[PDB]
Every structure is written in C-alpha cells, then in structure tokens.
Assembly symmetry: D2
Homo-oligomer: 422 residues x 4
Amino acid sequence: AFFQQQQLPAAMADTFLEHLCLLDIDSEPVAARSTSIIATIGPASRSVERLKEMIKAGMNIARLNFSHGSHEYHAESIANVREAVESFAGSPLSYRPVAIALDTKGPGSGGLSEQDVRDLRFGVEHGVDIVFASFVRKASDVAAVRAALGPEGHGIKIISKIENHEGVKRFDEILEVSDGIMVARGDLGIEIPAEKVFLAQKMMIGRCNLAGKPVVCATQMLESMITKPRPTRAETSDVANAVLDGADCIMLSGETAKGNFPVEAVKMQHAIAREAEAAVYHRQLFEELRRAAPLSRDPTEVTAIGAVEAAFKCCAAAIIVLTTTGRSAQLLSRYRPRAAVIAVTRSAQAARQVHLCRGVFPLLYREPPEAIWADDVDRRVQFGIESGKLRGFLRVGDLVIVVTGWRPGSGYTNIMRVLSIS
Amino acid sequence: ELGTAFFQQQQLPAAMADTFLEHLCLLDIDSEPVAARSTSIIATIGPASRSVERLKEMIKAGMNIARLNFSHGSHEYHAESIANVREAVESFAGSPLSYRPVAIALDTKGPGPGLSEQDVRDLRFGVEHGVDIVFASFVRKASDVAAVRAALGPEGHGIKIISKIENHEGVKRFDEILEVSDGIMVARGDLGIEIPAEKVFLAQKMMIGRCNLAGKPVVCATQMLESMITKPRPTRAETSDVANAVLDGADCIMLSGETAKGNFPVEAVKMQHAIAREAEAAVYHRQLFEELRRAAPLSRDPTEVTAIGAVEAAFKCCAAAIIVLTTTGRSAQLLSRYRPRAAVIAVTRSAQAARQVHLCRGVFPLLYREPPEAIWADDVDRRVQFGIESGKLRGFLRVGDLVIVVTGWRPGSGYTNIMRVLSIS
Amino acid sequence: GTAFFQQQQLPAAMADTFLEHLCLLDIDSEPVAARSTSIIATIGPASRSVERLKEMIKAGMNIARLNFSHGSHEYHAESIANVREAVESFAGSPLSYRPVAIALDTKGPGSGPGLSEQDVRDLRFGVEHGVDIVFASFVRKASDVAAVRAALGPEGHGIKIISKIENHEGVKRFDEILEVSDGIMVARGDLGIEIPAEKVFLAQKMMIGRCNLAGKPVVCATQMLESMITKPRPTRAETSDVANAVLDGADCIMLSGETAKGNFPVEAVKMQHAIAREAEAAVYHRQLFEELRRAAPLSRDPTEVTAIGAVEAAFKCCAAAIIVLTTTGRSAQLLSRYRPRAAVIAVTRSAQAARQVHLCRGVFPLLYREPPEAIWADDVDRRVQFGIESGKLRGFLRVGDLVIVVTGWRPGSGYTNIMRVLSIS
Amino acid sequence: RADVAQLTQELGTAFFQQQQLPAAMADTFLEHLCLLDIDSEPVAARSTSIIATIGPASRSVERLKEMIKAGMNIARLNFSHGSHEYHAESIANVREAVESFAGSPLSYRPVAIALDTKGPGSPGLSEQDVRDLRFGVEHGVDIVFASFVRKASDVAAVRAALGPEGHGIKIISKIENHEGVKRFDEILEVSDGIMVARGDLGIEIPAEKVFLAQKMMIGRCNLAGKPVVCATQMLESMITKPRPTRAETSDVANAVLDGADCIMLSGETAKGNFPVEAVKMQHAIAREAEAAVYHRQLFEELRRAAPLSRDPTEVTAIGAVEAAFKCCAAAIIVLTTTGRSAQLLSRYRPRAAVIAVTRSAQAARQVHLCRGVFPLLYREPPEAIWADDVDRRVQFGIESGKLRGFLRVGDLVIVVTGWRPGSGYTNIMRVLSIS
Ligand SMILES: O=C(O)C[C@@](O)(CC(=O)N1CCN(S(=O)(=O)c2cc3c(c(O)c2O)C(=O)c2ccccc2C3=O)CC1)C(=O)O
Ligand SMILES: O=C(O)C[C@@](O)(CC(=O)N1CCN(S(=O)(=O)c2cc3c(c(O)c2O)C(=O)c2ccccc2C3=O)CC1)C(=O)O
Ligand SMILES: O=C(O)C[C@@](O)(CC(=O)N1CCN(S(=O)(=O)c2cc3c(c(O)c2O)C(=O)c2ccccc2C3=O)CC1)C(=O)O
Ligand SMILES: O=P(O)(O)OC[C@H]1O[C@](O)(COP(=O)(O)O)[C@@H](O)[C@@H]1O
Ligand SMILES: O=P(O)(O)OC[C@H]1O[C@](O)(COP(=O)(O)O)[C@@H](O)[C@@H]1O
Ligand SMILES: O=P(O)(O)OC[C@H]1O[C@](O)(COP(=O)(O)O)[C@@H](O)[C@@H]1O
Ligand SMILES: O=P(O)(O)OC[C@H]1O[C@](O)(COP(=O)(O)O)[C@@H](O)[C@@H]1O
Ligand SMILES: O=C([O-])C(=O)[O-]
Ligand SMILES: O=C([O-])C(=O)[O-]
Ligand SMILES: O=C([O-])C(=O)[O-]
Ligand SMILES: O=C([O-])C(=O)[O-]
Ligand SMILES: [K+]
Ligand SMILES: [K+]
Ligand SMILES: [K+]
Ligand SMILES: [K+]
Ligand SMILES: [Mg+2]
Ligand SMILES: [Mg+2]
Ligand SMILES: [Mg+2]
Ligand SMILES: [Mg+2]
C-alpha cells in the first residue's frame, strides 16, 4: 500500500515518458504540502476570523501590496495577521509561523522612488520578513532597496520581481545579489509578448533551482476564482505546472485580496500543489540538481547533499535540521528531497522566512534551554520528532535524517545522523 | 556554412543542452521561432464563427480542424456550418500559398447504457456529410468505441474515432480504449467535474504520455483560453496552459466557447497559434527522441523502420523538412510519432487523408491533383518536387537546404521502405 | 523466436545500465554475427609459404603486414607475390572470395629528426608493388605524416597512412597526427619502453576513444598473444588483452612474432578470431550508439546523414546486414563509425578499396568483378544481389531476414544518399 | 566548468590535472576515455589489494619485509603444494616480517593470511581439505580460498570443517568450472566473496569465454557488495623476466577497471625470479587503473541498482560516499569492529580512501579484501567515557592519516561512527576540516 501512494509507481520509472504514463489519479498524496502559498491580504481577507481560516487552509506568507491602501490600512492588516497567527500558539507541537511580505509600488517613470523609501521604512518599523521589490531591472536596483531597509532591516529577505524585458536579460546579475526571484507575470505579459511569458517563467525557475534560491510564481493563477467558486481547467493546470517547473512558492493576488472566495482559493492551491509535488520525477530531478551543484568545501553544503542522498536511500519520512538563520534548511531544500525538511529554530523571523524554500516546515522552539549544550540539541531534535508525530509527518518505526552542527552559532552544520522513530 | 544566427533561433542553444535542467536555463525570450506551427488547432464552429467571411479569417489565423458540437444546434444548422467551412476552404484553391485542407470533426452528444439513439443519427449524419473525424463523448470502455465504429455504417470506416475521456472509468480503462481508438481527447470540462479538479493535470499528462508512446493523436481540450470568450487578451494561466499542453506532447489543442460563441474567435485562434509556435521550439528533443526510441519496441515493419531512420537523418543535418508520399496518412503518422523538429510535408492524392493528418503533430498536408504519369518512378518524382516547390513557396525550404524524402518501392499504400537525403536545387 | 533473443548476448544488450549489462553476460550465449574486428598478421618465415598463407586466410587473416625493419626489398617482393598467389587462389569462387590487404610497416626514423632515406626507398617500393596501407613507424607530429605522403608521390595518393604512436611526443601530439592520418596504430612495444609500462593502457584507451570519436581506424598491436610464439594456447592475460582491445573499440587487432616467426601462426589467427567474436557480442551497443551519436557533430554531408539513418534503421529491425555500394570505401567507413551490430557488407569494383575497408570494424568487403550493365539502375541492383548471394553463402543472411541497402543517386564516388529496407527472399 | 570553478580556484588547476580528474568530470564514458592522460599522475593510495602467493622465492623474513614494503596485503598459502610444516614456517616468517614494523602505527601494515585449498579432485569435501582447514583454524588464518566451489552446499561443507573456532574466517569461493559459473548466484549468497580462478576456468570452459565469466562475476559481486579477486597469469612472464608483456599490464589494469577488489600473483611470487618486482608492478598498474575508473557512471549505477535500505549503516555509508565526492574528501575515517561499516563504504567505490580504525587485529587483516579500505589497528585501552574513546580513535585515524600522507592541513575528511558501543550501530556521518 505504501508503494501505491504518492505516485511511487511513477517515481520508480526509468524514463520521464514512462513516469508520465504511470501517473495515477487514484494514487493519493501522503507527504505534507511543500510549495508555500503567498496570499495577498486586502478587503476580502483582512478580518481576524477570515485570517484564521486562511491559515488553516494553508496560507504561509501574507503579502501586503503597497500599490494600494495606506500605511494605516496595511498596519491594521499586519496586526490582524499577527493576532490570527498567535491565536494558535496554545499547542506548541502544532503552531504555524506565517511570514509578512511587503510588495512595493515600484519606480514608475523613474531610481528608487520616494514612496518606496517610505514604504520600505514602514516595513522595517513593522518587522516585515520579506520585501517583494517591484520592477527590478539591474543589480543596482536591489542595492538601493537594501540601502533603504537600513541597518535595522539587514535580515529582511529581498525577492526581486522580474517584470520586464530588461529584468529578464539582466536576470543573472539580479539573482546574484537577491535572496530570490518572483516571476511577476502580470507586468511581464504586457512588457513582453504574452506568448513568451512561459519561456521567461521556466528559464527563471530553472536558474533559481540551479542557484539554490527561492523562486515565486505569481499572478492570475486562479483568476476566475475572484468571482467563481471553482477555477477553470487552465488555472488548475497553471498551478500544477508552476510546481512541476520547480517554483518554491505560488501566489494569490485578487483571488484573496478582493475576491469572493479567498479561503477557497487558498484551499485550491493547497490541493493542487500536494498532487503536483507527488508527480515530480525525483529520479531525474535529483540527479540533475546533484550533477549541476558545484563541488564544495563548505561543510553545510557537503552535509546537505549527504543528508538528501541518505533520505532517498531509506525513504526517510523527514530530515530534521537545527538552524539559526534558515541556511542549513535552504541547502537541504535545494536538492528537492521527497522527505519533509523540518527546521527546528529559536528565531521567530527565520521560522517565517524559511517558508520561501520548498519543503521546509518551520518549528519555532519554545521549551526550556538545557544546561548541557549537547542535551539542548537533543531536546530540539526530540521537539522536531514530537511535532512531526502530532502533525502526521512521522510515525513510530519511521527513519529520519537529523542534521546538526559541532558548535553553537550559525555556520557550523557538519553532522548527519540516521535515527529510528521511537 | 549555416551561421551563428541560425544557431541562436528556435531555442537551438536550449536544444543542445546536456540535461533538462540546463535546457530550461537556456530558454530565451529573444530566440525567435522559425519552424511552421506543428500543433493543430481545433476550433468549435458556432454562431460567432459560422459565416464564410469569418471562417476565411479563422483559416488564415491557423484553424486546421472545424469541430461541430452535436450537443447544441440541429442537423440543418451543422450542415450549413459544414457548407460554410468548405466554401471558405475552397476560396483559397486559386493561391497555393494560402490553400490549406481543413478537417471536419463531429463531436457527439454522448450516452443511458450503450450508444444513444441521437448519437446513432448524428453519426449517420457525419457519414452522409463526409466528416473526417468523430470526437466520441464519454467513452468508458472498448465496447463504447466498437459501438461508434459499428454506427459509422458501411460507408464511414475511414473516419477517425477520437475517444473523449471524460470520467473516472475512461481514465481507469484508458489502455483498452486507446487500443481500439484512432486517438484520444482529454475532455477536461467533464473530467474536472467527474474527478477532483486538482487531479485533472495527472490524467492529462498520463494520457498524453501514453498516446505519445502508442504513436496515436491526443487532443488537449476545454477552457484553454476561456477568458477570451469576453476579453481580447487571455490570462497568464491560460497562455501557460496552452504552452504546457504542447510541452506535455499534445498533437492538437482545442477552442470551444472561445470560437463557438465568444466575442474574439479569430483572436483566440491567433493566440493558440502564437503560443504553440513558441512552445514547440522549447521542446527538449534530445531527451524526447531518446525516450521515444528506447520505449518503442523493435519492429520489422518497413514503414516504421524507415520512419525512425528518416527522423534520425533529419536531426543529424537539421533538415528543413521530411517529405513523405502517403495515401492513407500512415507513413506521415509514423514519422510524427518520433517528434522530428523538421516539418513533415505529406504529399497525398487523398483529400480525406490530407484533412485527417492534421491530427498528427508536425504533419503539413499537400493535396496533389495532377493526373498520374505512365511511368510510376516519374509520378513519384513529380510528387517529391511538388513537395519541395510548395515548401519553397511557403517558406519551409530554400535552395541549398537538406531534406529527407520518404517513399516506397512500389505503388499502393503499405510499402514505405526508402529514405533519401536530397539537397534542394 | 525466443532462441534468437538468448544468443549474441542479447539479454546483456537490453540492460538499462552498464553494470546490469556486465551481470547479464552469459558464457552459454553463443556469438551469431560474423567477426567484425580485422586481424592483421605479420608475414615472416613462419607464414610465407603459399600453402600456409591459404590456411591463414581461411583462419581469418584480413591484412598481411610486411615489416620493413627486417629483410631486403627482394624478400618483401617475394612476400607480396606469395600473399597475392594465396589470395587469388580463391578468386574462382567470387561469392566466397576474401580480399586481403597488404600493409608496409616502415623501419622508422631511428636517431634522425624525421623521414629516413631507407623509409623513402621502402615507401617507393610500396607504391611500385601496390601496397594498400602504410604503417608509419614513430610518428611524432603532423609533419612526419606529410613527409610519408610526399614520399609516396603522385602514384600513391590512394594508399592509407596509419600513423604508429610509439612514444611520449606522439601521444602528446595525438590530435594533430590523427587529423592528417587515415588512422592510428597503438604500437605498444615501443610505447611500453618510451613511457612507463603501467601507463600504456591509458594511452591505448585514450587513442582508441579518440579514433572512435573521429570515425578513423585504430589498430591495437604487440604482444597480444605473445606466449603463442612457442605455446599452442595463450595465457589468461593474453585472451583478456585481445577481448579488452575489442571492448575498448579497436577496429583491428595485430599479430607480430605470433605469425612472423612462431610455431603456431594459424592457431594464433584462429584464437584472435574466436576471442574477437565473443567480445563483439559483449559490446554494450545501447550506451555506445547513444554516445557516438551525442558526440558526433551535425553534418550536411549526405553520405554521413544516410549512414546514421541506416544504422538507426538497422538497430530498429535487428537487420542481419547493411549492404552498401562503395567506390573508395568511404560510405562503408561512415556506416562503421556508428558501430552497428548489423554486418556492413561493402560491394565494390575497386580491388584496392576492398582490401583497405578491412581497417574499419564490421566492414565485410566483396569484390564485384562483372563489367557494368548498360542500365545503371540494373548494375546497382546486380551488385546488391551479389551482396545478398554472397551473404547467404557465407551465413550472414537467410530468407526472411531484413537488410538495409545503402546506395547513391548517380555513378561515381561521393553520391551516397539512399537507404532502403529490404526483405530477403 | 561551472560545477568545478570555485573548487578549481580553491584547490588549483594543478590539483584538477592529477589522478585523471579531467577524465573523471566527463559527461560520457566515451569522452572519459578520450580524456585519459598519461601525464596525469596518480595521487591516491593504492586501493586494490595485492595477494602474493608465498613459496620458495618469497619465504625468507628479509624477502617478506621487502614484499610488505612493495605492497603485499594478503599472503596466500597454496595447500596444493608443500606440507603443513612448510606452510607453518611460511606463516611464522610472514608474522615475523609483519611484526617487525609494529613499533609505530605510521609504519605498521596488517597482512592477512589466506589458505588456498587443494580441492575435491574427482564430489564432496576431500579428507585432505578437512585436515588443511583444521590446520588453518589452528594457525589463525584470516581467509580460506576454497577451490572448485560448484554449489552452495560446497561452501557449507567448508564452513562446517572450519568448526566453531573458525566462524570468523572469511570464505572466498573459487569459481573454476562451468557448474560454478551457472550456479554463481547461489554460491555468492552463502560466501563472503569470490575468486575468478582463471587457470582452471580457462581449461573447464573455452579459453575465449573466460573474460565473459570474469566480467559477469565481478559485476555481480560489485552489485552484491562482496569482495571479488581476479587471479592467475596476470604477470606470468615475470616468473622469468624482469618486465611483463603488454598483454599482462593490460590484464592487471582491466581487472581493476572491471571492479575487482583484489588482484593476485601465483608463480610470480611463489617460485619466480622477481617476486618483489611483480608486487611493485601490480601496485604501479593498480594505482594508474584506479584513477582511470569512471566514478560518475559507476556511482550512479551502483545507486540505481542498489535497493532501498532501512539499515542505518548502509544509509550512512551512501551519505558518507556522496559527501566525500562533493568535497573531494581526502579520506573517510570509519570506526569498525568487524569491518562491516568499512565494507559498506567500499561497495559505493569512493575515490576517498576508507581509513578503518579497529581494535580487532583479525578485522584489520580481513578488510584488505574490500577495495579502498586502509586498516589501522588501535591498541590503546578503552577510555572511561565511551564518547571520549570514540573521539580518541577518530583522532588516531587523523594523526595516522597526516603522518602517512593521506591527509594534509586544509583537507576535508568524512567521519563515520555509531550511537552506542558494539557492532551494527553505525549511523553518524560528520564533515571535519583538518587543522
Ligand atoms: O501597481 C501596479 O504595477 C499595477 C497594479 O496596481 C494593478 C492593479 O490595478 N490591480 C488591481 C487590484 N489587484 S488586487 O485585486 O489583487 C488588490 C486589490 C486591493 C488591494 C491589493 O493589495 C490588491 O493586490 C489593497 O491593498 C486594497 C487596500 C484598500 C482598499 C482596497 C484594496 C484592494 O482592492 C491587483 C492588480 C497592482 O497592484 O498590481
Ligand atoms: O454536452 C455536454 O456534456 C455539456 C455541454 O452541453 C456543456 C455546455 O452547456 N456548454 C455551453 C456551450 N458551450 S460553447 O459555448 O462552447 C457552444 C455554444 C454553442 C454551440 C456549440 O457547439 C458550443 O460548443 C452550438 O453548436 C450552437 C448552435 C446553435 C446555436 C447556438 C450554439 C451555441 O451557443 C460548450 C459548453 C457541452 O456541449 O459541452
Ligand atoms: O591442484 C591445482 O589446483 C593445480 C595446481 O597444482 C597447478 C600447478 O601445478 N601449478 C604449478 C605450481 N605453481 S606455483 O609455481 O605457483 C607454486 C610452486 C610452489 C609452491 C606453491 O604454493 C605454488 O603456488 C609451494 O608451496 C612449494 C613448497 C615447497 C617446495 C616448492 C614449492 C613450489 O614450487 C602453481 C600452479 C595449482 O596449485 O594451481
Ligand atoms: O543554518 P545555520 O544558520 O547555519 O544554523 C546551524 C547551526 O545550528 C546548530 O545546529 C545549533 O546551534 P545553536 O545551539 O546556536 O542553536 C549549530 O551547531 C549550527 O551551526
Ligand atoms: O502511408 P501509406 O498510406 O502507406 O502510403 C505510402 C505509399 O506511398 C508510396 O510512396 C507512393 O505510392 P503511390 O504511387 O501509390 O501513391 C508507396 O510506395 C508507399 O507504399
Ligand atoms: O563510398 P563512395 O566511394 O562514396 O562510393 C559510393 C558510390 O557508389 C554508388 O552507389 C555506385 O556508383 P558506381 O555505379 O559508380 O559504382 C554511387 O551512387 C555512390 O556515390
Ligand atoms: O562496522 P561494525 O562491525 O558494525 O562496527 C561499528 C561500530 O563501531 C562503533 O563506532 C564503536 O564501537 P566500539 O566502541 O564497540 O568499538 C559503534 O558505534 C558501531 O556500531
Ligand atoms: O506585480 C505583480 O505581481 C505582477 O505584475 O505580476
Ligand atoms: O466535451 C468536452 O469537450 C469536455 O467535457 O471537456
Ligand atoms: O612497432 C610496433 O608494432 C611496436 O612498437 O609495437
Ligand atoms: O586455482 C586457481 O587459482 C586457478 O585455477 O586459477
Ligand atoms: K505592488
Ligand atoms: K458534445
Ligand atoms: K617496423
Ligand atoms: K590450491
Ligand atoms: Mg507587477
Ligand atoms: Mg464533455
Ligand atoms: Mg615499434
Ligand atoms: Mg584452480
């Protein structure tokens, strides 16, 4: 029965063609949904009660579009998101972190606009986790956004939105200085011929997967759900294909900001992403990611590939990783393991931001610290196991891969262990 | 000899990549498509696209197959639409650069247990009106196809039956249905109501993959450009859906309400044409050909053996086209199953085969009407040169190009066994 | 039949990985195909008699090597005459006649910077006596090959120059030497003294791989069955060395003292024949063909394009043979570079080309002696029928087999462009 | 180039020109062959073990010290010749020559002692074999090369004749005839490893078919993760000549490229005029051939073919080998009691040396059967705290590694350990930087 679920017959195929031939509508997804859902918060999804339903439906990142509303309006939305999120902190083995992303208005006819400088300052003051920088055309646009975030906003992730021909042509220099990319198909579909957007999307997703950096697929994914309770056949296909292309995140704009079915749109993206993640041909994907990833003498990078290889060898239910900044979880995520990457962190901000990396399930550690650092690490690993059991990721008898470091502090990941559950 | 400019067009840098991941990384929005659009467009003919003048614009925009949905209208209404399609098609017989065969497909209302009374009458209407294809609704098992086949009376055994898979049973019994059908339609409208909407993409990818492996045509249908029923431009999900159907391996893409009743029928055809051309150049032929080769069983049929040799030869020299002589369309279909990048120019005397080969990706039919030469080898050479001169006229070929020419050793269908490499003079 | 698929290591041939291919090799799976790696036998006192040379031709000797490091011009002229007498003794039965090449192996440069004056005289003797191949000793750079070519003069333009790589400089300048040579000999005797003995296998494997990639003949030479100079059976290392030279991709394997001066010249030829047949069936064609195709550049030469199409067609149907008409041997060489499992039966009127194509693995030359038919197409057909009749007599073909036939569109060399699938009747 | 650019800037272009690294990075086997370079020098320690037959030409303690220095890892005693007294004296001389270097862990070299049986002659285990096997147990031999194994019951008979005191002895079944080849799978299943005995095999089956049997058995042993020895006439002419033939060097190189864990010398060391030179020649060829292995395809094929495993030692071994390839690790240091954790690393054919730290003198000798395993015998008494004892053993491996030239400051090493004492609990992989 285990080998009939999660498209495992299609996963064992010797060619991509045979893998497609073996895809089965009766093979149910079992693994947790790996692709994060970004929901735009607006009039239809602002209330605390509505936000609780959206968190339960699967929203991982709340996007505030600074092209609309005001600072007062967006601060109220942020407060409602935080109130809805913290309303679940009662059960420590089930709490779900939710990131807050600020999407800028953009430069318009002009460097960094004066409104963007003020909105970026608002983001820093309100503790946003991510900035989706509109109309990034070159590396210097990213540097300007980074400067406007100042010294207090050093830890904020900058996801550059590629929205025009110049951004596509200068993609490599933009990706080099950004934390990640957003394929902003709305403007891209007006800036370049509409029939070429899929080439830009597939190229950028492939290059971000190669670089090990997050990539978001955005705009009109479930557009008809703004007024209708069910999406079109093209819309479900678009969501599934963004996941199969390799997108770390999928986004909802008007579907959640102003539409009549915000919760249903999140549930639809969740249901499609789960099905599409099981349909990924890991045999080819892992081999290609492995071959293309450069040789490295960084112990975190070396441990990450060893851990992902070990996870595939035993059909590991999860890879539990201890991380301060999210980096060790990101390096595991770049190899696209089928095993969930359960990231146990004390940083509330890192827990929110690792939603940008596919297959990373953040757990915020809130238990008393042990006197012995070796015993503290073991408590954090046991926390990951207990949360995993409660959430359905793990069961007694499962094998897990545990990734830890040799000394406290960020940058010292170097250990992989094979653990049997209970 | 060819030039660096040649190797920058039609996603040739992405085509040379050693992995699928590197192929995606090399896709370039500035690399322009050069080859003719190979995925056929099926347009549903209804009130918005019924007039002879509108049909001429749809043919110019790229419509290859006219679909008549017998779930709506009447026999009289559909006969008038068929007459208008044939009048619009024959209005271009005076210009070789514009004349294009257009197939006529009848889409049945559907089943009750067996074949419905109305379907028996509509299938009889199809035979009497000389339709080329039947899109059989709600095919659930092999016996449903046999019933449709039996209904195509004594005169319609040459009509292609494309079985529409619209529910759980059709998906589960897919292999037995494909075995007795000429092809498959992934009918996503009903499929998305019969099975969970989030599972339709799995059924689509599986059926397209299995049809590609069997060498049989597969149509992707329903809501591909849905918003274009009321809007002049499609959504980002819609253009992606059309491109991904082509990348999945679909031989045909379809328009339903977009052309039957919408405000932008011609624009919807133009949009499918533009997207399919871009998507066909983005196909990773290096892996596709290797996998089609490895999965296809060994064959002692000369047509099949010649077809793989011709496709291998075409890739080796970047041949502008593979010109094939065919009476039934079968030799062109066997070339199409290996997904050559070279256009398959099929020269035929059969007007029906010319219309029907639109079901096979990359087949460009040329109907030949010259009287037969007394010496067969001369009649063969005349048809080969007709394909080259039509190719030159349409932009497929230029002097100095290499073409692969597929023929047989004796007249009559079923004897293809020769592949030749010709330099265009 | 199931019996067909158990022979010639076909279970190992279908394996999905090289490791599984090795695991499926079966000592009970008998070789069926004709031996495709040519055997070069050095002529000396143990192999000079006309009667002994007839036994060596029957055992499998394809090329007779004359070693100009020993004996006078008078001795080599008698060797040539004896070889020709033994070869022409079988000319009375044209369907079974086996051409045998005569290769001249030069003394070399010695302490000098390039072409010696003895080499100049010996090379002129070769042209005057009609040698087919020169094995140029101690080639260190491209200018050494040009000097050999100049010493052959205007009458020796058709002689093949196989450069012997025997020292460090030759290995380091390999690419420039291969570019101007017709092929290479891995001369392991001197190579094993010029470079560390434990490195010779790396030089052998590298040069064989680069010659396979270039589509040029490579010979593996020296001490392959050394112990058979005095013993009737070889050592375990010797049989392994011959099998591994074939698995590496060598077109030819050589015997030196084993046939020139040893006690078992005929047995040494029979042993190389038996090993080579076993090793050729053990070649993992699935990976080899895929790698040869991926590495071979795109080509606009119709002979090369037809050759890859013909090899692809032959693999698709398990063709017993590829029958090719050739004037210079070039069309057969271009088929051979893709390493088909099907035997390449080359029909030619050129006695020299028939001898020289032995340098290419899997090419079986047939010398056609009939004068040309008045109708060119009939002359082509008669030559194809001669290939079929010789093939049936020799065991290559049977009624019911499929063969691929490669011909051209006009008389004269350079116009191969047609591939055809023929059923043997 | 992009997959090696940062590491090329760090380690240098000179590093990437040695040990056939340009051929190792090739995308196809054909391009890998085209990139093999006679100027690319081997750097890694020789990983294929050399089995030398001990006889009249190689029996003296002084000669044996030269053979150990030349590279002999396993001393074979052929019970088809000599007597119990003769073989006991050879064993004592091997042990005296081996223990003469026991003054330091950076000079000590464990050497296994293998007993090769006479065989059954004309069906069951012969009476002479029962006595010779009893001699082996009494003299503490590490391995038995069982002659003419034809079926699984032949290896059970050898195991029974070894008795309750010889349970730890490795049984390597010699495949010497058609029946042994045909019943190979059942024989490998119950044996510790295999020997392709080409001498008898070349007389029992057609000589032109021996290479098929050799390549098939080596491939199946590689797939099973069990040791395979290539034997007989590898350097035959070196019995009387100081240099081998071109076919002989090719045969040794091709046995290593085929996947043999061990290569053997018979008359070359037992009775020949150049025993030390024959060992040196096998050492030099094996080092060149190991660097020429196309690891990219080999590792991918070993992974595709190996079934999924829920054994933590197996899971840790593949993770450690993957990690070693990612950073061009100089070594994988593994703690082992029986040799099993080192054997599971060896089955994935890492380019990194597997330095196996063990307290078992017998396991240190027996791991020579596994390609790429370098045994270090740890002699210190156990620390009070087990975690400290583990750390001391890992540091012993690092210090021996530095002293012997396997490791340098700045190198990355992979360290493989377990969660509790005792055999069977390996489950940890660590990446350590050498300081
Ligand atoms: O800036 C650009 O480059 C272009 C553009 O303005 C395009 C545009 O006009 N759009 C229409 C509005 N939608 S929306 O329905 O998703 C949407 C609507 C609203 C808000 C959004 O954040 C939002 O994203 C509010 O914040 C919001 C706040 C207060 C009251 C109402 C709302 C609200 O109606 C997005 C697309 C854009 O922004 O891309
Ligand atoms: O049969 C089924 O199982 C379900 C269904 O009936 C579903 C359905 O009701 N649909 C609404 C109509 N569209 S349509 O806009 O594409 C479309 C509309 C019309 C016609 C169509 O052929 C047609 O396909 C006429 O022939 C037509 C003829 C005469 C007057 C008007 C029209 C016309 O308005 C298709 C979807 C179907 O058929 O799938
Ligand atoms: O029974 C078999 O399986 C067949 C066979 O006996 C074949 C055979 O006869 N051989 C000849 C002898 N060689 S040998 O030169 O390597 C060699 C020679 C001698 C010894 C060997 O162990 C030995 O291996 C002594 O122990 C030895 C001890 C005391 C005095 C002299 C010697 C000595 O001359 C091996 C091959 C075999 O064993 O395969
Ligand atoms: O992923 P990051 O940011 O590098 O953090 C990983 C770090 O987490 C640890 O596992 C635990 O560190 P802390 O005790 O500081 O939480 C370190 O050993 C390791 O260096
Ligand atoms: O694809 P089909 O229907 O088998 O037709 C292929 C046939 O066409 C030809 O090339 C030409 O035949 P005709 O002259 O009868 O048209 C035949 O030699 C070959 O058998
Ligand atoms: O292999 P080559 O030397 O190019 O010769 C091939 C030539 O042989 C032919 O098949 C027959 O030519 P001939 O009639 O002159 O022998 C030509 O059509 C073709 O060009
Ligand atoms: O390879 P083996 O035979 O399983 O031995 C590995 C064992 O060695 C250890 O690393 C150390 O064990 P000891 O302390 O008993 O020597 C164990 O944790 C592990 O189980
Ligand atoms: O801003 C966006 O999200 C877009 O344009 O797609
Ligand atoms: O009938 C159709 O076309 C459908 O259901 O999608
Ligand atoms: O010249 C040769 O043949 C040699 O050196 O091997
Ligand atoms: O017994 C042996 O070692 C042999 O036959 O090779
Ligand atoms: K915005
Ligand atoms: K219908
Ligand atoms: K010579
Ligand atoms: K013995
Ligand atoms: Mg935008
Ligand atoms: Mg329907
Ligand atoms: Mg020489
Ligand atoms: Mg023996």
